Structure 1
Amino acid sequence: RDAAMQRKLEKMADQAMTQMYKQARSEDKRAKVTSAMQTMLFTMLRKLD
């Protein structure tokens, strides 16, 4: 038990870590692109009024 169960605890904890890493990088990209498009909008109008 304890020398097989404890072997699965590590596996599951580490896959949880890697998936939270991927989710973090994902939501990072989101912030980046939304900042970029906001900048594009705000600079577009600044040529017409």
Structure 2
Amino acid sequence: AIASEFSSLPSYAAFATAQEAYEQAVANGDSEVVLKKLKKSLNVAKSEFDRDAAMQRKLEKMADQAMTQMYKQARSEDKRAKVT
């Protein structure tokens, strides 16, 4: 099951459409001015990938530490909120 960090977000479809307009326009050579415009809008659209993917990467690092410490954790019977 292939699913990249941002591919699972709804905002990725807006990116995929914006980058498609760019890659199609540059491949077809329709208008040299449209390339410069769509390159600039692509940087905004692609940045949403880097933004979400950075959040998921950082969360993974912190959550991995939270799972590791749970094996080395001391034995203490205290009433805490535990989700499952």
TM, length-normalised to structure 2: 0.46
Q: How many residue pairs align between the two structures? A: 45
Q: Structure 2: 5+ residue runs without aligned partners?
A: 1-30, 76-84
Q: Percent identity?
A: 9
Larger RCO, structures 1/2 (Cα 8 Å, 6+ apart): 2
Q: Structure 1: 5+ residue runs without aligned partners?
A: none
Letter in 2 for 1:12: L
Partner residue in 2 for 1:11 = 41
Partner residue in 2 for 1:33 = 63
Higher share of residues assigned helix: 1
Tell me, in whole angstroms, the C-alpha distance in 1 between the residues paired with 2:64 and 2:35. Answer: 44
